[PDB]
Swiss-Prot record, chains A, B:
Acts as a component of the centromere DNA-binding protein complex CBF3, which is essential for chromosome segregation and movement of centromeres along microtubules. CBF3 is required for the recruitment of other kinetochore complexes to CEN DNA. It plays a role in the attachment of chromosomes to the spindle and binds selectively to a highly conserved DNA sequence called CDEIII, found in centromers and in several promoters. One of its GO terms (biological process) is kinetochore assembly. The lineage of its organism: Eukaryota, Fungi, Dikarya, Ascomycota, Saccharomycotina. Pfam families: Cep3, Zn_clus. The keyword DNA damage does not apply. Component of the CBF3 copmplex, which is formed of CBF3A/CBF2, CBF3B/CEP3, CBF3C/CTF13 and CBF3D. Present with 1900 molecules/cell in log phase SD medium. This is Centromere DNA-binding protein complex CBF3 subunit B. The gene is CEP3.
Length: 517, 517
């Protein structure tokens, strides 16, 4: 009697939290006794790359950015125009043995910008600018590869280290500047915070610190303020909501200090429309690892907010004469859709409302649509936005999970569409895309083990091998996130039995630990 | 009619806060366009010093520490014995091109220990170990100097950079460890947090982050816990209260993120006796920059707590057979005395209670006593503890300030005793001691200008040139702490008239800005 189900949907909330979120993008217990350390390999490497870039080359990036990446870089930098000047002086002082701090800070800010560019640059327009030729060698990878492969992704990664290595030249610890928060924000537009979850969390904490160090609570240019300062405050506010955004996104056990929590939910300007929407995403996902349920009255309150923000989003036109307006419209629409999907998934899980699953299937498709429509406009670099990756993960997983329990040919098809789409997302998503693919493959194998094996009522609860395996995938990731052993090493250095056979079998064939990166 | 006075004592609370505290030890607006930056001069320098230290040399430091500095290093490291092993393996791996992270972390922890040692090492016992010979040269300072001078202090400063430079090798941002918090805590025992207020605040924020990253709320080894873990928790708790302590101490505008605030005041074990007492210091000083007054009932509640802690302190014996027990007793007694002084100063200022000034004069003398008694036991290195410096500053200043307004031959003498003592505190206090001396000299010159010039009742308020000069010293320091201009540069880069003659005169002869370091 599939009467258990309700307690099983409620369970997904934690599986989502632990596996699809924490475990796949924010986990990384490394053995320090085995990790090489030094301030030498990063100095030479981030010195070579800086050489690989030519004056004109870098300037086309500036143009790719100005003519494309507006919706990302604005929030934290505003009209690049002002920055070209800096990209210019960058080279001027590029020829000096004598270098300052305001100098480097300006350097790093533009090198984080370059990072973002390489990241989004359509592989084709990138090749017409650089050539893997003088790159395969240095690195040491046969010319067996090219731009089409991660070799482009071996720049959104290294350029990123050139931004960090350069900040490490300002000794930013000792000289807080908004430019550190600005550089980080730009690096945030990429997969950097997922590649280096531990570092990114420390750099964000530094950014929270640097931000509060200005002690500005009210960003509105108040009466009789010098226009220069009225502007800096306004700017600071844009930077602020951008900062709350990646803060909420990087939430987890390895990120204990918060900033976004100092900002109230709506349940209590285009730029700020961004946080408005993320505010609602926070309002919902906050229940994933929670024990309590979102009162139904709440979901409706958020539903109503969505409505207004949905409307408000379409109300902001889009002229295809600028990729800027097109990419902004995409992020807008993707964001609301995502929150919407999350919204009805919630209804379906906590209250099993009417039209819930129908709605989930709807926004699930709206999502696949938005991504799928970007190949059809040769603005596919739009899909490289870290938001896509995140959304597809939660959507596919839940659908893939719902599929193994609640049969439906509608969902079975949707799952096919998503399964396809998954292994189609741009490749700049590296290691993770594969990890998600593996994760999908896995939850499907867990379907078979549910159709094969027989569930049985003990009278108090139901028992199945796919039930433990699910429970385990959480305990195993939840343990990979307990730093207590790490504490023990840095200190005094001291140091239903049939399923039990079925589980361990699967567990050895498909260990969740394979998702960790 | 000296009827104004009450509002003038209340004013001292802010002068103390801004000048004697923030302005003298936690201020540092530097021009980034003028600051040289690089990861080269620290790598070579912190490579030379590391060479200057010999195996046996460093090991005597270990012995100075084990046989002296127990009361400082325990809280965060516990029985050095365990660490000698590390000082040993330090050298073993000292001969490697291949170096890890757990490696460096252990290195830095012992190099922070060395720092502390050099800092406290009696100049005499230091010379019998090292020789300025191979030091004056490298640096570039004529052999015109020697250990007796800051040349010893050019180690508690460089050794400190060797601890930092080495942490910068573990990329601690990416690999949080308690050893970072432990190293910082040891560096805390020195004047490091005052030499580099901006850096120390960022390293502390990193420590708050690293600490919470363990997610341990209850430090008591709870039921059926593996003794190894029960021990690590207990350890972590010692580290925790030690961490709240330097956190409260480093409070200010440049340190926006807090940790100690997560710990309640008592008004709501020897190791924890430390925070107990600092908790009471916090309970009192929290009113310095506040607008409201400490209800009298509060002061009494703290007074009563002091009593118990005073008693509890004397109740912990002291055998002069170990400098350890002697230095612990000193810190104990100094702490309570200090809080006590603060306590009655408060009574005298906010409520003008009876025996207040008498009590202030009492603990003021008890303090001078405790410091003065350390030359008389050739354990003068006891006075090098950053606590002394801090306490003498608040005591001398207030006394020096009370002196210019409220004449008394008792205070006039006390002020003489303090004025002497001031220019007698060990020299490892460098730049600051002089700044305090200058500050004292200054408040005395402000006495003359009060005896000379004539105060006058406008009927609504009283007006005097020493009144503005006082008000100004605050606005001028309070402005040196407004980062809004720093925000403006890192961004879009845009950019009673007789006293009015008297003030500016003084102001040019004795500018408070001279205290900033």
């Amino acid at each position: 009697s599939k009467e258990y189900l309700p307690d099983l949907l409620l369970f997904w909330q934690n599986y989502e939290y632990w596996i699809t979120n924490i475990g796949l993008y924010k986990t990384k217990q490394r053995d320090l006794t085995r990790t090489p350390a030094n301030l030498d390999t990063d100095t030479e490497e981030c010195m070579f790359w800086m050489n690989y870039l030519q004056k004109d080359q870098s300037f086309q990036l500036m143009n790719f950015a100005m003519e494309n990446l507006g919706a990302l870089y604005f929030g934290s930098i505003g009209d690049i125009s002002e920055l070209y000047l800096r990209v210019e002086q960058y080279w001027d002082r590029r020829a000096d043995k004598n270098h300052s701090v305001d100098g480097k800070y300006w350097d790093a800010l533009i090198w984080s910008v370059f990072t973002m560019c390489i990241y989004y640059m359509p592989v084709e327009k990138l090749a017409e600018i650089f050539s893997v030729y003088p790159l395969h060698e240095y690195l040491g990878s046969n010319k067996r590869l090219n731009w089409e492969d991660g070799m482009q992704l071996v720049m959104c990664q290294n350029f990123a280290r050139c931004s960090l290595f350069q900040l490490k030249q300002c000794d930013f610890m000792a000289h807080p500047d908004i430019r550190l928060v600005q550089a980080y924000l730009i690096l945030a537009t990429t997969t950097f915070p997922y590649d280096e979850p531990l570092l990114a969390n420390s750099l964000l904490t530094q950014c929270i610190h640097t931000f509060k160090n200005f002690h500005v609570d009210d960003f509105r240019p108040l009466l009789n303020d010098d226009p220069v300062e009225s502007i800096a405050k306004v700017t600071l506010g844009r930077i602020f909501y951008r900062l709350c955004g990646c803060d909420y996104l990087q939430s987890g056990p390895r990120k204990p200090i918060a900033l976004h929590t100092e900002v109230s939910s709506l349940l209590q300007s285009t730029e700020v429309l961004y946080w408005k929407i993320i505010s609602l995403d926070r309002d919902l996902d906050q229940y994933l690892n929670k024990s309590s349920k979102p009162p139904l009255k709440t979901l409706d309150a958020i539903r109503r907010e969505l409505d207004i923000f949905q409307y408000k989003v379409d109300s902001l036109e889009e002229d295809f004469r600028s990729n800027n307006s097109r990419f902004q419209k995409f992020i807008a629409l993707f964001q609301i859709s995502t929150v919407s999907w999350k919204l009805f998934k919630m209804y379906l899980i906590y209250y099993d409302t009417a039209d819930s699953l129908l709605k989930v299937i709807h926004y699930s498709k709206v999502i696949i649509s938005l991504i799928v429509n970007n190949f059809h406009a040769k603005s596919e670099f739009f899909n490289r936005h870290p938001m896509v990756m995140q959304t597809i993960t939660r959507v596919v997983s839940f659908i893939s999970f719902y599929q193994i329990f609640v049969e439906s040919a509608a969902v079975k098809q949707l799952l096919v569409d998503l399964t396809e789409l998954t292994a189609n997302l741009p490749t700049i998503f590296g290691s993770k895309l594969d990890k998600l693919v593996y994760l999908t493959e896995r939850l499907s194998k867990l379907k078979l083990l549910w159709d094969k094996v027989q569930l049985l009522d003990s009278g108090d609860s139901f028992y199945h091998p796919v039930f433990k395996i699910l429970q385990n995938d959480i305990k195993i990731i939840e343990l990979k996130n307990d730093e207590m052993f790490s504490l023990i090493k840095g200190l005094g250095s001291l140091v239903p039995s049939d399923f039990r056979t079925i589980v361990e079998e699967f567990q050895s064939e498909y260990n969740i630990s394979d998702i960790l990166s």
